[PDB]
Structure 1
Amino acid sequence: ARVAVLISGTGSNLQALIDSTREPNSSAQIDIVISNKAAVAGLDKAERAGIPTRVINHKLYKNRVEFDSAIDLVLEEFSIDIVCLAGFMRILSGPFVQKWNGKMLNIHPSLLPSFKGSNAHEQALETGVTVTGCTVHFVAEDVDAGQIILQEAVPVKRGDTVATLSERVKLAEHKIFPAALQLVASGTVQLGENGKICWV
């Protein structure tokens, strides 16, 4: 399966995905890395791996449905089968999420039914849970509510801050994101017709 990773920052998860797809048994290949910003060091890691990089910029023109179309064009140019959101800070339009239904993966820093949103760690700490984690799921129109592929629980330690807890959860992210991409790319897991995850 041909893969495109959309980033917006450092992209630590991108590196994990790059290392994973380079293994001989990987059923996925990363062909294009699309960045939201044009500075972020995610593009550099892509370059070091010899992966085509390419930017966009909202400031360049139009509404939302357009910006996504500018991306979708690059996706068509490279014949992409699967999309991985690796720290892509920019909501997608309803049509784009429609076009790539069951073909776009996202990693969220919480045991998902809980703490949906962009500040999951702050919520977890404020709520006082002793166990949190991360989730890889198919992207649906309903934010952070697509079908769950994999999850990994991570303990919260007393005195934890966003800096220390995110660091611990990040180690779990580097494990399940690549594993989930392999499950989807190999055809082992797919968005089920009954709406639920299907393990063939």
Structure 2
Amino acid sequence: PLRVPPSAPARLVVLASGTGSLLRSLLDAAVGDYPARVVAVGVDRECRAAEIAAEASVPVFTVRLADHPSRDAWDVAITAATAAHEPDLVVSAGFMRILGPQFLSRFYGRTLNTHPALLPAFPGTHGVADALAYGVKVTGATVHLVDADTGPILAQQPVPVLDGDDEETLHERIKVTERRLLVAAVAALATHGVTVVGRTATMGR
């Protein structure tokens, strides 16, 4: 079984490819007595997340797939760059590349993703549209461990579907909850650690 010990005060690396809205919430939370700090942000392209990091005086590293001869070579480089910061936890919810086997060898159990549905319902890139089309009244957000997207679930929180929602309005309501849930899960993992038996992840004492 997977055992990840507590790491508070924890070092967090955020991997990002996009607008950095989640990074904003992490940076805002990760101050004072919050049990982690964002020590670095890694990106694979120019993006607003890199700008948000730099504005917060957080080091930014860039590892572009295009700068390496193969995905295996890129995997080694991003693993080395991330490991260089000695992270206890990695958030890759906003990262738009698949993390490879070298990265997972080092960071499985410590790498977190989010999804805008209550997994296992509505998996994939269109989970919000799919939930809306199905006519559910409750959807939600999931934080789960990254693996080789059905990794062990760390945390979930429900979100209502309101009569007359479109994809954009529902997705935005879910994203609001996703940010809070991720911030809470990072803190819990830092302070409590996690153990995984079967596919069930349990926060420690």
TM-score (norm 2): 0.89
Look up the match of 2:160.
155
CA RMSD of aligned residues (A): 1.5
- Aligned-residue offset at 1:36: 2.1
The residue number in structure 1 matching 2:195 is 191
Read off the aligned partner of 1:159 and give its amino acid letter.
Answer: G
- For residues 12-27 of structure 1, what are the structure 2 equivalents within 5 Å? 12-22=21-31, 24-27=32-35
Instruction: Please list, as runs of the form range in 1=range in 2, the aligned pairs for 1:1-200 lying within 5 A after superposition.
Output: 1-22=10-31, 24-38=32-46, 40-141=47-148, 143=149, 145-186=150-191, 188-200=192-204
| Distance in 1 (alpha carbons) for counterparts of 2:129 and 2:141 | 14
Contact 1:138/1:147 (<8 A) preserved: yes
Q: Report if aligned partners of 1:64, 1:92 keep a CA contact under 8 Å in 2.
A: no
Residue 195 (structure 1) shift: 4.7
Q: Secondary structure at the match of 2:74?
A: helix
Instruction: Provide the aligned length of Structure 1 versus Structure 2.
Output: 195
User: What is residue 7 of structure 2 aligned with on the other side?
Assistant: none
Deviations 1:100-132 (A, max 9, x none): 111101111110111111221121122221211
Conserved? CA contact 1:189–1:197, under 8 Å: no
Structure 1, residues 3-35: CA drift from partner, whole Å, max 9, x if none? 10001111111111111111x211111111011
**Which sections of structure 2, spanning at least 5 residues, go unmatched?**
1-9
Cα 1:120–1:177 shift into 2, 3 Å: same
Q: Distance in 2 between matches of 1:77 and 1:199?
A: 27
Q: What is the identity percentage for the equivalent residue pairs of Structure 1 and Structure 2? A: 35
Q: Report the 3-state secondary structure (helix = DSSP H, G, I; strand = E; otherwise coil) of the residue aligned with 1:158.
A: coil
Which structure has the highest strand share of the two? 2
Contiguous gaps of at least 5 residues in structure 1: none
Runs of 4+ in 1 over 6 A off after TM superposition: none
For 1:88 and 1:14, the matched residues in 2 are separated by: 11
Letter in 2 for 1:78: H
Amino acid at match of 1:168: R
